Amino acid sequence: MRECISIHVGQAGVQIGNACWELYCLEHGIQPDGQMPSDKTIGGGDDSFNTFFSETGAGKHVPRAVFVDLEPTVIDEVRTGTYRQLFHPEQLITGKEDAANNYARGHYTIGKEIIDLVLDRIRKLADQCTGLQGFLVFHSFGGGTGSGFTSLLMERLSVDYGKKSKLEFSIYPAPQVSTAVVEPYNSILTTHTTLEHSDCAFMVDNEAIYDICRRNLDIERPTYTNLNRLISQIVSSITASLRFDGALNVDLTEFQTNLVPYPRIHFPLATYAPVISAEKAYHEQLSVAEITNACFEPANQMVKCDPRHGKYMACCLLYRGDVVPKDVNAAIATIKTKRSIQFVDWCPTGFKVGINYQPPTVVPGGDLAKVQRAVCMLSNTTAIAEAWARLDHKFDLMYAKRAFVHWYVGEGMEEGEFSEAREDMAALEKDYEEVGVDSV
Amino acid sequence: MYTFVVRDENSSVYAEVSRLLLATGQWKRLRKDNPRFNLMLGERNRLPFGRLGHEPGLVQLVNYYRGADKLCRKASLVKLIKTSPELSESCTWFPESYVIYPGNVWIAKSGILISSEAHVIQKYLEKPLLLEPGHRKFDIRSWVLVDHLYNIYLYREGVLRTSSEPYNSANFQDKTCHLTNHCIQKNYGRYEEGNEMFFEEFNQYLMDALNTTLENSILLQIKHIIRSCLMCIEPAISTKHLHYQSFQLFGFDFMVDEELKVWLIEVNGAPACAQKLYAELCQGIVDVAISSVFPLASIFIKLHHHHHH
Amino acid sequence: REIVHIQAGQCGNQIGAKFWEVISDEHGIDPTGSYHGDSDLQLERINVYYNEAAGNKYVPRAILVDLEPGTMDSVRSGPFGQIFRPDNFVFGQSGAGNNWAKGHYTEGAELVDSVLDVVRKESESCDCLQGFQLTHSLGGGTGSGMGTLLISKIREEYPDRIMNTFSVVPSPKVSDTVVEPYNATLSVHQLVENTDETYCIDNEALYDICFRTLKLTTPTYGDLNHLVSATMSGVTTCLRFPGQLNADLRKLAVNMVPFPRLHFFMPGFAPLLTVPELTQQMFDAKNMMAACDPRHGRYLTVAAVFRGRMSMKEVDEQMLNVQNKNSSYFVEWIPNNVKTAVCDIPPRGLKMSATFIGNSTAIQELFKRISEQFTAMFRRKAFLHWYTGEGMDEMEFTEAESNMNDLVSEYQQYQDATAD
């Protein structure tokens, strides 16, 4: 059992969903028609991949997933694209008119008209589970739908499924590919309203991904496709422990216990290696040591910040492929003797390690090399609060003049919601300060 | 007591600064070769910067930035503009100019010659804004103070240095109508005192004749230009973290064309001031540049801009 | 999805027709309404501006309005005149004689209901109407007064749809008709309250461009309208061809309008090459379609649209360069206020082009000019009997003047604001 349900919200969430499900199909040997010849138990089973896929009597393997957008053109591409047969039509839900980059339309004016249908389709998925574990929610911070509708949905899920865990994958805005001036408003509004409803959230900064694609894959001007394929490799590293078995495999829930010391402090920093082109991977085999070292190079982080000027509260290493513990231990010993790794005084310094043997996969025609071994580090560090600071400053500059605020008031919001949200962010920055001070 | 030395006898500005400091009661002047000074008012030529900042127990301050000559010579300025990416060969507010070693009207300068035949060669501005009455050319002087922290302060009073001759397209040999220098003019004095017009009158004129203000039509561009020039050289000359500190007073000269576009002509590294404003400006230097470092027992606009993008 | 287009009066109808000619040419639609293009990119978002009729015929979603009949004849005889729906022509007989009060209160009020019937029939069959665009001049009688009446009535029936205008501002260099500043002030008073977006197309600037830059010694209306049609084509490019961007009129408005009253834009076009040259030229005062120097103010927001095949890396680098070198002209308290679009399909007869849309406080210079001419007449009450004879009070003139002065003062307030 232990099933998980994925929810993909708005453009960014949908398109990242496409990249993730394509990659999962390649990892498990599922064809685009849904057939899986290696699966000899027809119509059911409790194999590890059944946490993410259900099975019909006709042998089709069907994602446990809902896609939601308030306009139709992005999800229409899924309806007509390569993987159109993977999904039942009731899983693909669209309205007619979007939120126009406005949190208030996604949470209230437009969002209210579709929330009950979305919840009922989710209920249909939940009823097929024999031991549902929780939810995975994919969305942008900056869009009207990804911010406001996601907020609304999280509130309703807490009502209908109680304390059942909810995890986020959240796209943090960058000016190089950003399309709206108001993205800082939406980011604070959704972060305030979701903070009590989420158990754990993985932020992905578009500027970090853009930089990595340019520097390591030699792509002059990266597209959404490049970014989403790399993101999907990180997501796959995180969920691999849920989707494959094995004796050195370590459950993600067990990492959550270690990653979250207080309910509000639930935002891990992800780092992935190696990201390398085919031309450079040739005749250059990367060892366990080289990739483990690369996990402490800030240029490989998913969020721009400097862990060397904060403190660690947890540090986890998720290996996949041709990796044995002996080489892990030698690499860790070296890193401990060489780098600036300072823990808070109320927390032990041991690194937690997992190994999955199933090797990494790449998509055909991609810009990533196929490699024999890879690693994802997840750290809980105070340095991540720098990203909140950057966003809060931009919020202040505009709000002092009330710029664009009339667009929100016209949909029924009050200024009090702006200032209440901003205060909650101020208190979060203060929490991150308090957890790094020494005991007395 | 703070202590100071005077080493340039011809500075009017610093003769008044000196007299003010003395009349404070809390500053003592020393002979030009005593090394135990807090503040040097230096010479213009070959100021000995290598001998500053090596006196235990004295904070030492000087009224010049080492390296600022790069901005304050014509050839150096042309080279800095063309070769600096923050300015570039396509800089819109500086006239097209070419270094030469020993509408096609040009001016040669470093005795001046303006012709369309034939040092720096610079495009001569054929369509200047002409003041009425008198159909006459002018230039704008602005004073700017840069402190030890590299704050950039624009003195709120400027001056227009006018011609008192009608402008003549068809005579570039005769320089009295083309060149607005104070000495060269002394019909001197007819319209205004000493061929100097101040901001209150000029703003009134722009309102009455062109239905706009000095602030909107002209001053935005002046501020943009001053800030761009000084931010360009900041890494080369800043004294932050250095063992001695610097401030300096600069004189920017501008030309205004008939569509209200502002052009930079010249940066002067050792300006004098218009008479009427000595008292006020020199007091401002003491307040902002000296007592900030050596405290005792606003006429400026601070130029700062941090746009996010 | 669907946009409904309205053109009112002589000026509005002439530029409307040119707009429909240019975009019909860009989509490969002939005067009969048949598609004969070479590329699927032409039809993918065709329905934004065109209906499909039987036989795969494409018919503009366009309504044609005047109080003067005969402009209807000149349109109908124009090259694309057969393409328009015959029932969409709504014309009176009387004329308005350059009198705003006739357009807004008397002759135009009688006809407005028949105009609304056609509007409603077109709107009812839209899958998902985004809103409306109107072309008119502000200096005549029909387009200014009746057009702003139409705007008010549409807002009553579609209060949640976007209302956009392309509004031609008068200049003594093109028309000597003496009452124009009255008509423009009275219309602007309406526009401040009831539109989301107004492109200020200034006949002053168009004349100066035709004379100085294009070297046309005696500019005709045709030369001005060539510039207008190229600009309007540029500014609707991002809705009209498939291309990285997923937007609707409301999201554009949300990106461009920080305060509800400050929604009057300065358009530009270049050339009248390399990416640096285009970029430098589009930010030059001489390329603006409003007679304003942007260096006499500050930008609240800017959109830049490039057309043709070029390097996206290079476009990004040049936009950053102009912002870095001209930083004083962008308000520091709105981060990331410059947006860029690239369309692969060039306009007819060019390999590369740029269209500019600016929300600048320098637009106050335009409003000041008009204001001066207004006061020159109002202080002597010249020609006022033309308007009071239609039932108007002096008081309405006083209020309109006051509102335009307030708009100016507000632009100045945001020009002077700082961050610290």
Ligand SMILES: Nc1nc2c(ncn2[C@@H]2O[C@H](COP(=O)(O)OP(=O)(O)OP(=O)(O)O)[C@@H](O)[C@H]2O)c(=O)[nH]1
């Ligand atoms: N990484 C990544 N970011 C994306 C993608 N698509 C959009 N974004 C980012 O998401 C933000 C815009 O939000 P969208 O997802 O496009 O908006 P939305 O949820 O559809 O909301 P509305 O369209 O306003 O109703 C911008 O910061 C984009 O850079 C994507 O495919 N991948």
Ligand SMILES: Nc1nc2c(ncn2[C@@H]2O[C@H](COP(=O)(O)OP(=O)(O)OP(=O)(O)O)[C@@H](O)[C@H]2O)c(=O)[nH]1
């Ligand atoms: N740019 C441009 N301006 C025009 C054109 N036609 C008219 N104008 C301007 O429009 C203004 C006059 O308004 P009109 O459009 O003629 O007035 P109307 O809407 O037809 O109303 P009436 O003629 O009174 O019935 C003048 O200032 C002209 O300069 C045109 O084709 N192009």
Ligand SMILES: Nc1ncnc2c1ncn2[C@@H]1O[C@H](COP(=O)(O)OP(=O)(O)CP(=O)(O)O)[C@@H](O)[C@H]1O
């Ligand atoms: N390119 C140009 N176009 C138009 N006028 C010009 C010009 N270059 C110089 N001038 C005119 O010539 C005058 C003097 O030139 P110059 O820049 O040498 O002054 P200057 O250095 O002798 C005075 P100071 O040193 O006190 O600042 C200017 O005031 C200006 O009126």
Ligand SMILES: Nc1nc(NCc2ccc3c(c2)OCO3)cc(-c2cccc3[nH]ccc23)n1
């Ligand atoms: N406000 C606004 N902007 C426009 N283009 C600039 C832009 C491009 C890409 C952007 C962006 C803004 O914001 C984020 O991405 C066009 C328009 C318009 C007006 C009237 C009729 C129209 N028919 C089609 C368009 C349009 N209106």
Ligand SMILES: [Ca+2]
């Ligand atoms: Ca099975």
Ligand SMILES: [Mg+2]
């Ligand atoms: Mg969307």
Ligand SMILES: [Mg+2]
């Ligand atoms: Mg007419």
